[model samples]
Target: GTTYTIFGAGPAGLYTAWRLVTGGKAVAGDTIQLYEWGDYAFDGPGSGTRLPAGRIVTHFCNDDPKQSYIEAGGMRFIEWDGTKSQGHQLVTLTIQALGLSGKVIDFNTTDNPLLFLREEHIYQNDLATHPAPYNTPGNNEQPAATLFSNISALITGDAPVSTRTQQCAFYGSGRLPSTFNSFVYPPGSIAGNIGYWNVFYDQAGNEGYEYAADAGGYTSNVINWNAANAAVYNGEFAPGGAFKTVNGGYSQVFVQLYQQTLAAAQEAGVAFTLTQRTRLHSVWLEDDVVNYRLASAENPFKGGAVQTTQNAFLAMPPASLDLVAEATRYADMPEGTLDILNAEGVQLYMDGVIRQPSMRVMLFFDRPWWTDADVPYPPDLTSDGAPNTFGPTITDLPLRQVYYFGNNSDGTANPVYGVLASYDDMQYVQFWQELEIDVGERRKVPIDQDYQVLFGPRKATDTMIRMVLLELAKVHWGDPNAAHQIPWPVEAIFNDFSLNPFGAGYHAWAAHYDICDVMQRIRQPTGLVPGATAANLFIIGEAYSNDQAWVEGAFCTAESVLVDYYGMTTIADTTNYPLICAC
Candidate 1:
């Protein structure tokens, strides 16, 4: 008996629509509409290259399905098999729901990556020499992960704590993880609600902290955020664990979700529609319902003059939601009046999480020159492996981490071998973004056909290729001068999430904000206005999730929103999983 409108057609939005359509809670007269700003179609292999899976783009480097490809966005799922974490369960269930369980395969991600730091190269486990050349107080000849593991042991009271779910007990009612942080902190006492970087510098010292930052392959991982959350984040996702993904790509899961939702709606004779290239501009409360102003190329007032709905579910990232207040408040309010961004509660929590910029580049080469001397060791003892030896390589250079995907799925000779040459999440986002010619356009073959065919993700600029090659050489050969030995890339596809609408690749909680209160309050932004009555406008996405950067975070927010606000049964295991954060 009600109409539902979902903005942002990523997993979060798609899941919302799919659940509403198939949850058995919808009756005769309910309608569901899903909106996306990017143009897309689900038929083609690399189709919907624009923003179909929103930050889950997989680059099919070659035309053949069997050819080498790379993930430009989120690529792996830390599977829950009663082994580590009791999460990623929703992702598994959703895949099963789509009947695409056959596509699920073990994601052999980077392990024992080469640590190229301070003109020094060492395998993480070998510890042949200091990973951090500075050689300061605490990091005297220890593995990069060992120093981190020590922090884990001091806080969790275990040499290697289990997953975030078990160690933090994030679901159970308790104080912040910082409650135990005082143990490793100065004098075994917290100075105050402080930045994590400051706390880490105190515990690990400058050189120890520097080693972790450079060797871990991200500045944000070491960058100051919430000390409480950082303590928990520093723990597991440990060396050994089970990880998996759809054989084709992570985005395939969303494609299946979209298809299944439509099929379910058709069978039930329910009204479910997805309008691509359509965007939600802003929203307002009017006459007991939420009114969303929408915009598309055809209909421009740059406003959503389309239709009003009884309920609105905004499943957009924090950066995407920031666009809601970019323009005026639909001409009804006086100019310069306070908008949603001006709300004390919304501002506190909306900015509650800092969006960390990220970039990933997939480079295709004619052959595997990386298999030569100073070779990276592999997880498997297969010299017969895809000429494969070694895992990812981490360096202080702009090319933070590199993962070799090998020539092809089958070990036979292929036209090209792919390497995720630059897996940059080190705040070097703008460094590469500015290097590209057409910042974010999909990489296309220069052939004179329709511009619709997407050869890869974002095309890497020529300068980017040179820089990556030079830095990669430095990681392997200890000098950028040996760049001549590296092969020039045949193809390079890249993507930077630092641009507008997405602002950053992922989000992190700021210090001192009560996540428990912020997530619930930010759900309904009518609370943004002082003393305003509750309206149907809701905000849900990974930015507000407990598991921030992972794809599981998106599922977390969507499932929590649906079960708690809407009358829907969650597919996630709720016998142990609480709907809200216990903090």
Candidate 2:
């Protein structure tokens, strides 16, 4: 038995061990053991175990024989010099303290561009005409191209794509079923051209595909570039070339960075333990201590039967104490038992720490949150008295209450503290869709009747519209509907106006053509992109920065409507919202 054992092996656990060991509190050989299940790798959604650095490049290059040596993840890189939230500033203090100032580049601007591929590729145009088919040689529909052109015209004071908002109205059905397919450039590609090639090869069931091998028997496909694409106009022009990084393959830097970090940690008395066919079961805190446990389950983190237990310490901000105590039954202990320490290592305790064991403790160091004495429950307002309620909530509540577009207290007009109209805002759209489907199917309602009810009264509510469409998908695609009613249409519409390079022209114009094009893409039988089911479900928990109003409404139950919307079929054993990304 160890005197002090930490029950995790992740970044937090490793870092805590480093701090304790370096502070003369423990050593590698000491029994200050770090307990974790067998070292089976835990996979994350989207790109999985791979770091974000190489996502884009690795995914694109994996299929390229010539670029097989390279590992690229599917995310684009953007270099920022200032003390912004991302890049260098994220770990600036640590880097500086470690005398790694050379890593900081003070250039006013970095050459990183917001990378958009797949349907994201559609963003490389003016928002108005974006949905128009980027005109190819034979395919004259040009639906996506027209949308991009219309948006461009608005921003640059030019004309719309063709002065025909619904040009495709008369030619063929107004809908192009193929536009709704969601394409993601798979990670672990050696070349970035996979995304480009996929557009020509996979679009419309490989309609415009052509492959040509290079001098070394390496095949490369020609992407029928749209003349109006941003790459043609704004991309870097070079000798016989426009902007493209086919050189050293941009992924080399990311691999180097990841390796360097790993090496440093290993050198600091940390060991990289790997377990073949192992899995993580649980991580939790018990009796004022943290724990991490795992079992031999096939997929301990996601599926399979497994035993898990842990006494993991949950480090929380001062504002979350009440909810933490109430939800977890964690009583406030004495100062020395579980004390709060500042950056300088000074112990900070709550007022009347010993008297009120269940009053909740607030650490002095972390950002303080506003609390209400009269309001027993967590308030919508922050400690500063502002209704700062953007991002994910701490409790589990219903979709309507938790799904507000703004702070629950004032509804959707909290200005500085309100949730913006982004992809997150459309979560209710999906929730309402799932509910309608479940109810309609359970009641054995007729397809047309279900459709009518889903679309809602006067066809005004998105919930109703979604229900009708989802029912149609079930009809068209059958049982495991390949073309299920998903957010592809919504994602395309939102991406057309949200994601970086693509979203730039959103303010200039909100063209209906873009919406039509996205609709068209979604309808194509072969054009439908495979739903990332695991990724969609798992990532929602991690990346759902939705409001806590829903969670609080259900009295913080994990099984409430808020949690179910995220597809959390069963409660996760860990605390601290393990499945989400912080804002």
Candidate 3:
């Protein structure tokens, strides 16, 4: 007899709806109405739009051929903790219940070296040069040797006369030895440590680059340290770490869950309805029920009407609260609750808690150019006596993370071979956006022209592409000019996540705020008691979770609401679920 209206059809919304209906708490047509801002529900990985190829891959180049797949967004799945046995019970149970176990594939399970290169360091006068001596052994400029020397000096209590290099030496040697074990220092120490940062700064100083010593704020510090101590420092960092991704695309799992959940709901005489391309303008409470006003994005000029519901679940970001009229001033909420919600919403937007801008530029070629054996070096490069394939390569170029998806299961490349040409984030995003090219103007411009216009004025589009081609060519083929004859990509597509509707790609916590209390407050509304008055309004999303930027975050928040707000006894059997976090 009660109507429940849910907004946003991402994993959070979908899972919440599934639990409500399957727990015998709600019937379809008579009870639920789901609305999505996007044109299609469960369109692709995560909650965003994906390219037409439906082939955006992730976690590629695995020993198991079934693991390789194009992924535009949300590639890796982290369900287990440092021990690997303690799993994220809710996420694991959801995937199991949906019958998507076969789609899972391992990620971050190898010692993948991220080759770092600087523009000035790699090329002079637009010609290729040997790489810098950072990673090379027997070279005094090597970071590890320099770091070790500093540590040794500090341990020996020898005061060395100073220069910038000596000062860096003093800092690392003086600070690192206590926390890090000398036996497992270089290979076993956490990369997120201040020790690593000192080494990085020392290297940057040597390379004539100014690196910020205190860039990542408190939130970043917490996240980074947790990752370091929890996963990286432990031998469980990779190779042994169990990370998984879907073979074809992550969205396939969501799409299947949506269909299966809908079918089951219908069979139970639930009258479920899904409205797409609609935007929620306002929500309010009246006559003991929630009210929502929506207008179609396709016809914004047309007058919109309000719909009433006994319950409302908001699965969108807090920044979106601006669109809802009187969202903070609900009568059922206690005093000062509205003030906290309003402050948090505005702070989340203005304080820049959301992730920095990012752009994913994908290029399709006729063949897997890097995989060609004729090239000088192999794409898989060995570093620290370990072979690394399919990881990021740090370069001064706009390209951030160049992922390679090799041939299909039968050892044959797909007709339209694909590559993630660019995955620029943060500061690099602004650089690419400033490049002069009418994105709306469609033409088969020469790859050389694109390259020339981007780097500087010259007839060096071929040279530029040649630079990346050979750099990757040399890394993959061993010869810098091995891929010189390789032609430009046949097609390319670019997506910017900083634009409207998607202000940022993910969320982060600010140092000033208490994340634990905030996340708890997010799941529970303002009402003092647990009933229709307090439980009528609920919120769910990754932004409110500690596991930000991950699908697990969304699932965790969804599970929190299912158990805490709904009080459904049928779904409380989580004995098999491993506790991912004590909070």
Candidate 4:
């Protein structure tokens, strides 16, 4: 005899239900039920929120020239700085408490390293042979060029180059053993550049090194990383490899959390049940109290009894608010469990938002790429000649230079003198060991392997973006005509000369817009509240820029579309609805 019911079986709802039942507030056999509207095995949120395997490959996975898998996204097992953030600390603490520490994996380089950047490797050789006189060490030690040359030969098989003389004067530099050590392993290693070179080397091997000059490290790395990550999920590397999962896919992590939570609840004498395909119709509020009602299963068209109140928690799209409003309209008058109004009235509202509706517009900001030398225009210029650059020029050498040591002032290593070689060696090994643990675990769960294994959020974000867009046209949009148009934007973003992440960026943004679009389309009306065309709309934070630059752009477009297309101007007397902020 709880006070609320939740719809959908996504993480949010499932977690909520888990909490309520475990608290001993409700029993599984009682009024609390979870209803999902689609096939139990399929048609879930992930189908809408996850990218297809092929798209994942095209965007983030591929064989690096060095032949290592780079995980794009799926499972993230990061351990962030907990001091400043309680949430971060809480996440870490929760994992430990749940005995899930073994499940947490790391994708650092030692486990699976990245190749060198293409242009950088090319210029690396050029500088090695034609050293800049200025590149000599000021302290009578070996010239900086000497270390760079040796390091380049080890990684790229070339003498060090005077980066100062390369096309950008910043493009060429000798590879330092220290840098390579970092690239191969992390904690404090220069893994990214080394990772880039590793991909190029893997693809062509020694032969690939020659072509590295033509291949941009950033682009090749992105492509190869996606491919490798996918392969790991497919169980490409196994048997003590760095890409296996201890408890299988990250989904298993969630499942474990759910089961443990359920078990704990049972011990607490709380009852809980899991159901599929239930839609929330309305909230039953009396004298400021709130209750939840679901549609009856026996009679699909009729409303069921008021099941729960007090905490009628719900996790659904913004459109569902209308349904909640409609259901509440007739809370006092009972026709059935979900019976708030006539069938015709309910269908009309449901169709308006949840069915074939209007077009949803989203704004995207194109970030300048540091390695985009192929384009004719300066990286800062947008395709339309609009001055759309944000923040500072990305190419500023001081900012762009890969720091061998992150700010000597931080008390780590001195940029001028490097570190004690012994400590550097140990750090490199430590990085590799950490990464190996992550990859080793991923190998076990062949399907979701390497998903976010290396760079979890980055890859998850990309996948979510593509999945949202592609799935919408295929499922929720329902209009075949519009569905075809979606791919155009997707392709444009993936291969667009202007898009920094290229395929990754395109896939990510497309998925995000599509997800929001689907949410806007399928949400139906339930309670008595009058329907506002586009109220309570939300775009997942994952779709916005990794850094939150495009959030404003997306918000502006969503707001404009709601007002102009749906004639929905004021939401709670405010034109702007809540725009989810991405971390």
- Who wins the TM-score comparison? 1
**What lDDT would each prediction earn against the true structure?**
0.66, 0.23, 0.47, 0.29
Give per-residue CA lDDT, model 4, range 477-569, as digits (tens): 333243344332211111111111111221121110222322233222232234423222222211221111111222223333334333543
Tens-place lDDT per residue, model 2, 1-583, is: 1233433332323333333333333334443334332231223223223222201222211222232212111111223123321221112333343444444321111111111112122212222444323223433233222323332232222212221121222111222123223354222211112222343344433432321100000011122221122111211220011111222333333333334434543555444232323323332222234333344424333423422222122211122122222322333433332211111111111110111000000011111122324212222322243334222111111111111112111122222111111111222233333333333345454422231211111111344334333432332222324324223221100111111111111111011212223222211111222331111100000001111111110111212212333233323222322222111
C-alpha lDDT (0 to 100) for residue 128 of candidate 1: 52
Cα error of candidate 2 at position 14, Å: 7.4
Clash count for candidate 3 is 25
lDDT (Cα, tens digit) per residue for candidate 1, span 179-283: 444444543333225566777786677777877787763323777776655655675443234667677677668777888887888888778888876788776
RMSD of 3: 10.8
Full candidate order by lDDT, most accurate first: 1, 3, 4, 2
lDDT of 3 by residue, 235-334 (tens): 1111122556655656666676567668878888886666766766666554345656786756532427757676788876644444453443443643
lDDT at position 186, candidate 3: 46
Weakest lDDT window of 10 consecutive positions for candidate 3: 210-219
Query: Which stretches of model 4 miss by more than 4 angstroms?
Result: 1-4, 21-32, 38-74, 84-90, 109-247, 295-308, 319-583
Candidate 1 local lDDT, residue 504: 76
**TM-score for each predicted model, relative to the true structure:** 0.86, 0.26, 0.66, 0.32
By TM-score rank, best first, the candidates go 1, 3, 4, 2
